[PDB]
Amino acid sequence: EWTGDNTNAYYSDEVISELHVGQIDTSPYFCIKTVKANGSGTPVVACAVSKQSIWAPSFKELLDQARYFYSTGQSVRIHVQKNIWTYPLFVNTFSANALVGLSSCSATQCFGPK
Amino acid sequence: EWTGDNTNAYYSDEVISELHVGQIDTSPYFCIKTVKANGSGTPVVACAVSKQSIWAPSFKELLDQARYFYSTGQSVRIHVQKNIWTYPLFVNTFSANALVGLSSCSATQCFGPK
Amino acid sequence: EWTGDNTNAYYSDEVISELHVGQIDTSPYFCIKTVKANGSGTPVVACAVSKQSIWAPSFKELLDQARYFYSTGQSVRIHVQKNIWTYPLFVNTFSANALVGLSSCSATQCFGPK
Amino acid sequence: EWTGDNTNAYYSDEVISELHVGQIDTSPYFCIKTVKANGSGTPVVACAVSKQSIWAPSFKELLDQARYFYSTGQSVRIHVQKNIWTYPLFVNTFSANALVGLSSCSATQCFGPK
Amino acid sequence: EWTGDNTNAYYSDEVISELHVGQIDTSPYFCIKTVKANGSGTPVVACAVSKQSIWAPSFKELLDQARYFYSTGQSVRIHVQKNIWTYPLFVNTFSANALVGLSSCSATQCFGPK
Ligand SMILES: CC(=O)N[C@@H]1[C@@H](O)[C@H](O[C@@H]2O[C@H](CO[C@]3(C(=O)O)C[C@H](O)[C@@H](NC(C)=O)[C@H]([C@H](O)[C@H](O)COC(C)=O)O3)[C@H](O)[C@H](O)[C@H]2O)[C@@H](CO)O[C@H]1O
Ligand SMILES: CC(=O)N[C@@H]1[C@@H](O)[C@H](O[C@@H]2O[C@H](CO[C@]3(C(=O)O)C[C@H](O)[C@@H](NC(C)=O)[C@H]([C@H](O)[C@H](O)COC(C)=O)O3)[C@H](O)[C@H](O)[C@H]2O)[C@@H](CO)O[C@H]1O
Ligand SMILES: CC(=O)N[C@@H]1[C@@H](O)[C@H](O[C@@H]2O[C@H](CO[C@]3(C(=O)O)C[C@H](O)[C@@H](NC(C)=O)[C@H]([C@H](O)[C@H](O)COC(C)=O)O3)[C@H](O)[C@H](O)[C@H]2O)[C@@H](CO)O[C@H]1O
């Protein structure tokens, strides 16, 4: 598996606008919401759950990188795998998107797979 | 269990105004005090104890996130479970509230369970 | 045991003014010096030694919090247990005080036991 | 092996201009892109994969230092070993360079092997 | 053993001027270069190797502290044990000094052994 697999979705020119940390089923988790830097489109919500999904091994690196990009407000590409989380009230509050990578974005390209 | 269970309480548009770190019964712990950004309401105090309560697995993430939000002074939602901590002098100094999540707020927003 | 036990001493309205990191007997340790925010009184010197004293479990959280409050320069209450360290040259350089907690202070009170 | 082996390559007077974090084959990884501080030359890309290559033991230190130099924007020397990564779509997106060290640079010399 | 052993050397009123991170013999390492705040004297170089020397247990704490003092540029006392590293290309690039402690300095004294 790879962040860059074409079975994963991605959204360019996004800004991490919200950050949440919590716990579910003995597992710390975090969620982010991102919006287009230019104000178009609809928001993206993605979460990482420490003890769950094939992406669990990168939980710490993703949380640290999310905090970093959240704190600068820079434009990034968010990479997700859709339809991962399954507890309905969790998905309702957040989404079923697993966060699988984060890329900085230059003026006219993003530094990550497409 | 989940941060967003309806048996947990939450408080919105709060600012983390104080932070304490200590040890009790061989456990590092931390506590926070939050006040409404606009000066209304009554202060909220919540604590996390590494090694105690069902929320112990999320101690590190919550301590890191509390420090982050403390440093920015931004408005947040604090999620708690009431009536958890026992030692009466500890409760009297701080509270019996376990900290169970932290969410950012964007203009009385709050990105977390509701 | 608890940071707030009345067998521990505390000092309010202090600022962390020096920081040292070293190793002794295979243990990383750190020490801090605090002074009253108004410059009155005598400095408080306290140390934490990674594998030693009943306060060993909180070494990492105390080191991180000491660095945090040192870098902000904000007023704090420092909590210590006296007469812990024993190596004379170490005690003469620093002190015998074990660091057992750190509380942020407002202008009117400190967020911690007293 | 050593960062400074003459079988590694290095590039001086660079600035870390992009940063990406993801997961591949159960390993967190990160990649950076660097460009000449003075606008000359061609960009350099290098990656570190947490449990792959001889350089895996330094994954955390390299990620922390890459983030540090990325956030300061200061001039650095980047050290790489060529032709390490092999998944073609990964190499196409980033490169086959393994990141093996990072050195601060003054206006005249870089503090690292040469 | 102790940072303050009289068999260790130290240099007061120094500023950390350069920082390098790499790997040698499967171990992360870092080096720092320091110069007198007054711009006098010869530079001091010292290195820490995770996994090597009796000071290996404090590698993480010294790296974190070196990074901190590097970012502030404040005056510090550097504590070293001479003649520890022996790979000649390494020593010639950096030095044989093992870093064994870091102390903040005021105007009257540095907060560490002497
Ligand atoms: C009238 C019309 O043509 N409308 C658009 C068309 O403009 C868009 O084409 C370009 O898309 C560009 C960015 O492409 C990505 C991206 O990098 O973010 C590619 C992603 O593969 C795609 N992700 C998914 C799951 O499809 C992503 C999203 O479509 C997009 O980011 C919207 O996200 C949200 C939640 O709002 O876009 C860039 O946006 C250029 O402006 C576009 O011209 C086209 C693709 O977006 O769709 C047509 O409807
Ligand atoms: C006349 C009247 O109705 N007065 C108030 C009414 O205005 C309040 O409604 C709005 O509440 C908003 C905040 O809502 C929450 C919050 O998210 O912070 C919902 C929480 O569920 C609630 N938590 C608990 C345990 O009750 C929390 C607290 O009630 C509130 O934060 C005060 O807490 C403290 C310690 O001070 O409020 C917002 O404040 C709007 O401006 C209000 O219009 C309503 C809810 O507070 O109660 C009525 O008594
Ligand atoms: C006519 C001519 O000879 N042109 C250039 C010549 O100017 C260059 O000489 C000086 O090189 C200086 C930098 O040296 C290094 C470096 O530290 O960056 C040595 C490195 O070993 C080398 N790395 C590799 C893998 O070969 C590196 C790269 O060549 C260089 O950094 C460019 O890399 C990229 C991706 O653009 O240079 C410095 O640049 C001086 O200003 C130069 O005068 C000479 C070496 O670059 O090459 C000749 O073609």
Numbering used by the authors:
A (entry chain D), B (entry chain C), C (entry chain A), D (entry chain E), E (entry chain B): 24 to 137
Quote from the publication.
Typhoid toxin belongs to the bacterial AB toxin family and consists of two enzymatic ‘A’ subunits, CdtB (cytolethal distending toxin A subunit; nuclease) and PltA (pertussis-like toxin A subunit; mono ADP-ribosyltransferase) linked to a homopentamer of receptor-binding ‘B’ subunit PltB (pertussis-like toxin B subunit), resulting in its unique A2B5 configuration. PltB recognizes the specific trisaccharide motif as its receptor, N-acetylneuraminic acid (Neu5Ac) α2–3 or α2–6 linked to the underlying disaccharide, galactose (Gal) β1-3/β1–4 linked N-acetylglucosamine (GlcNAc) or glucose. The pentameric configuration of the receptor-binding PltB subunit per toxin and the three glycan binding pockets per PltB monomer play an essential role for multivalent interactions between the toxin PltB and glycan receptor moieties.
We also solve co-crystal structures of PltB homopentamer bound to Neu5,9Ac2α2-6Galβ1-4GlcNAc and compare the glycan-binding interface with that for unmodified glycan counterparts. Both unmodified and 9-O-acetylated α2–6 glycans bind only to the BS1. These results are in support of the increased binding affinity of PltB to 9-O-acetylated α2–6 sialosides, compared to unmodified α2–6 counterpart. PltB binds to 9-O-acetylated α2–3 glycans (Neu5,9Ac2α2-3Galβ1-4GlcNAc) with a ~14-fold increased affinity compared to its unmodified α2–3 counterpart (Neu5Acα2-3Galβ1-4GlcNAc), while PltB binds to 9-O-acetylated α2–6 glycans (Neu5,9Ac2α2-6Galβ1-4GlcNAc) with a slightly higher affinity than its binding to unmodified α2–6 counterpart (Neu5Acα2-6Galβ1-4GlcNAc).
